[PDB]
Amino acid sequence: TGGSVHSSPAIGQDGTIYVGSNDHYLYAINPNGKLKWKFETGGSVHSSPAIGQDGTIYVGSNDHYLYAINPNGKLKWKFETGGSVHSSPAIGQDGTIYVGSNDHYLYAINPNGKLKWKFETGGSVHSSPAIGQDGTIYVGSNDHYLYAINPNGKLKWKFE
Amino acid sequence: TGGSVHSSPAIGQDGTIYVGSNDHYLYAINPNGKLKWKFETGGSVHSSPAIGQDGTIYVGSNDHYLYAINPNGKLKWKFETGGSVHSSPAIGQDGTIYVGSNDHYLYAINPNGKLKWKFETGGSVHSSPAIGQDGTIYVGSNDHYLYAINPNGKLKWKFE
Amino acid sequence: TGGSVHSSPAIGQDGTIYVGSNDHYLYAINPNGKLKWKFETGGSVHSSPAIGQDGTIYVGSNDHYLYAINPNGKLKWKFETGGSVHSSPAIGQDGTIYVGSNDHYLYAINPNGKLKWKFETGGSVHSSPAIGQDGTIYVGSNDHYLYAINPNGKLKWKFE
Amino acid sequence: TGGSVHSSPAIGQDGTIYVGSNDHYLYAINPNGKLKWKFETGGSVHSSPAIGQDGTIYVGSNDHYLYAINPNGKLKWKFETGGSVHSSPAIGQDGTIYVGSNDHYLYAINPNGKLKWKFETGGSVHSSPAIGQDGTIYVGSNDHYLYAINPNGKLKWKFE
Numbered sequence: 001t002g003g004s005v006h007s008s009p010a011i012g013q014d015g016t017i018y019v020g021s022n023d024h025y026l027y028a029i030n031p032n033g034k035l036k037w038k039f040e041t042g043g044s045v046h047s048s049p050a051i052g053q054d055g056t057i058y059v060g061s062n063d064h065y066l067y068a069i070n071p072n073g074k075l076k077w078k079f080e081t082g083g084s085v086h087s088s089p090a091i092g093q094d095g096t097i098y099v100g101s102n103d104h105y106l107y108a109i110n111p112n113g114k115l116k117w118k119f120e121t122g123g124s125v126h127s128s129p130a131i132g133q134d135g136t137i138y139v140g141s142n143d144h145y146l147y148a149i150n151p152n153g154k155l156k157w158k159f160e
Numbered sequence: 161t162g163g164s165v166h167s168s169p170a171i172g173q174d175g176t177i178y179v180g181s182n183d184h185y186l187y188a189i190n191p192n193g194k195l196k197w198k199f200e201t202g203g204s205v206h207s208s209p210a211i212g213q214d215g216t217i218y219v220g221s222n223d224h225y226l227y228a229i230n231p232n233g234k235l236k237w238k239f240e241t242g243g244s245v246h247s248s249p250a251i252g253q254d255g256t257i258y259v260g261s262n263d264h265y266l267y268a269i270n271p272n273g274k275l276k277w278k279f280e281t282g283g284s285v286h287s288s289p290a291i292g293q294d295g296t297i298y299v300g301s302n303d304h305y306l307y308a309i310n311p312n313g314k315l316k317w318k319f320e
Numbered sequence: 321t322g323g324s325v326h327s328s329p330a331i332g333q334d335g336t337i338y339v340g341s342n343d344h345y346l347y348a349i350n351p352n353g354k355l356k357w358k359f360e361t362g363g364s365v366h367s368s369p370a371i372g373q374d375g376t377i378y379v380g381s382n383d384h385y386l387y388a389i390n391p392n393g394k395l396k397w398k399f400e401t402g403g404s405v406h407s408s409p410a411i412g413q414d415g416t417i418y419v420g421s422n423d424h425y426l427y428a429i430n431p432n433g434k435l436k437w438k439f440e441t442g443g444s445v446h447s448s449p450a451i452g453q454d455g456t457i458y459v460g461s462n463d464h465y466l467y468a469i470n471p472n473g474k475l476k477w478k479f480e
Numbered sequence: 481t482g483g484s485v486h487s488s489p490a491i492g493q494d495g496t497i498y499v500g501s502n503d504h505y506l507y508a509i510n511p512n513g514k515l516k517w518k519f520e521t522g523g524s525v526h527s528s529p530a531i532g533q534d535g536t537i538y539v540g541s542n543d544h545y546l547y548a549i550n551p552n553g554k555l556k557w558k559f560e561t562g563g564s565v566h567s568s569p570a571i572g573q574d575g576t577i578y579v580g581s582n583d584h585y586l587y588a589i590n591p592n593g594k595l596k597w598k599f600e601t602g603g604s605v606h607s608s609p610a611i612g613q614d615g616t617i618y619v620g621s622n623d624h625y626l627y628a629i630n631p632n633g634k635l636k637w638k639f640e
Binding site for chain 4: 321322323324325326327328329330331335337339341342343347349351352353355368408443446447448449450451452453456458459460461462463464465466468476477478479480
């Protein structure tokens with residue numbers, strides 16, 4: 001790519017490999033190593049993509065947006081947070097997309113790109129969320145806590 | 161925890177939540193938010209843990225080691241790389257553990273903790289590997305390439 | 321402090337040591353190791369402080385602002401950029417404050433806190449500027465270039 | 481350069497601009513923007529160079545070494561620490577070079593490239609040291625403390 005690849009790749013059902021690059025693009029690479037397409041964001045893509053059931057590719061960007069990209073490389077939507085999105089998204093069973101932001105919030109975004117809820121931690125959320133079998137969302141914060149957040153966006157507990 | 165939680169949590173079969181902390185520990189937290197155990201490495205744990213089929217927890221540390229920790233919090237083994245292990249391990253179908261290192265290599269480590277092979281890129285491997293259906297290992301590098309490596313440790317292709 | 325001290329300390333004329341912390345504060349510490357004061361910003365202070373000729377302390381914050389703090393620990397002014405200010409400010413002979421931002425610009429800010437000019441690079445400006453004898457401002461960018469900018473904000477040259 | 485320029489430039493007496501690059505080189509650039517020379521280290525140069533009284537250029541590398549490079553671009557010596565040297569060196573009145581390392585130590589190195597002392601903190605030393613009028617060396621650590629070290633390498637105080 002044109003820059004450091006710190007983003008961690010994700011693999012689609014047809015074998016397409018998606019990865020972000022410091023050069024600001026989300027890349028879609030065919031299994032044979034040739035470019036399928038590249039999608040330009042406004043900043044470094046350190047966030048690692050996640051792939052929804054319908055093939056939508058979600059990734060954060062240093063330009064403060066969470067991107068939802070169709071398998072053809074055209075934008076589905078982008079959601080603006082208050083700060084760099086270095087956290088990597090996780091997708092719930094109903095399609096909700098969860099991601100942390102440098103602006104200290106954990107975001108829950110509906111598949112349509114509208115905010116479901118946002119939960120304020122005390123510091124940047126660089127950690128990438130994990131979703132439990134019951135739907136609990138776990139994520140670390142720069143504020144030293146591991147958070148457990150219920151599906152409705154309320155604190156379950158925080159572990160110092 | 162005692163420090164920033166940049167590591168991304170992983171959830172075990174019984175619901176235990178594992179996460180690293182900048183305070184040098186790998187944490188195991190019960191579903192109720194109470195400590196199960198904390199394992200001290202020699203440096204910040206920014207790497208995100210992966211869980212094997214038998215419940216072993218693998219994570220890298222800034223102290224240059226890849227750790228394999230038993231579900232009870234006791235060390236199974238540790239493997240020394242040449243630099244900080246910020247990359248998050250991936251586990252193959254056969255149990256091979258793949259992880260990047262700041263020393264520029266992608267490591268393949270067998271379940272018993274012995275090196276299978278190491279693949280030298282041109283720069284730090286902070287990207288976390290993904291594994292395709294056919295066993296190909298994909299990982300980004302600070303040298304600007306996305307690498308596709310065969311399970312035998314030989315290059316398939318690299319995408320600038 | 322309450323968090324990692326990645327910021328690099330600066331020493332005032334009277335020996336006071338100033339440093340930022342990941343806990344969001346700018347610290348002013350007496351030579352005997354006791355707190356003089358701490359100033360809370362909205363986010364991690366990774367930027368390293370610079371000290372003006374009248375003792376004003378300038379530092380960037382993860383909350384996107386460049387801060388000017390009086391020697392007594394009270395805010396003089398804060399200037400909002402479009403992104404995290406990890407770059408460390410430099411002070412020109414005339415008192416102009418130069419600092420990079422995650423929003424890709426090198427900023428020149430007058431002593432009164434108003435914009436003098438902003439220069440657009442191709443990527444995040446984490447590098448901290450240096451000032452030559454003739455006033456040229458040098459800074460690196462995530463876009464791979466070392467920039468030389470004239471005092472009037474116009475490009476002198478860019479070295480790939 | 482061939483990669484991101486996160487290193488902060490330093491300016492020599494003749495106006496030469498020195499800066500590290502993520503492409504592993506330390507660059508020396510003439511005031512007119514043309515390359516004077518480049519020196520290859522083994523890893524990314526995020527550390528910001530310092531210039532000694534005699535013109536020696538000191539800089540850390542992600543390859544774990546502190547480099548001393550002569551004005552003509554030839555290696556004078558390199559000093560191996562136990563981890564990445566992202567801290568930027570400072571030079572004391574007697575020529576001692578101080579720098580932090582990811583291996584948790586603050587290093588004091590003699591001008592001949594041999595160890596004077598190293599001081600163990602509780603975590604990675606990414607902060608760049610500053611030197612007070614009486615020779616006290618101040619540096620932050622990932623362990624949350626600002627350290628004040630006497631010139632003999634013994635603790636003066638640490639500020640949480």
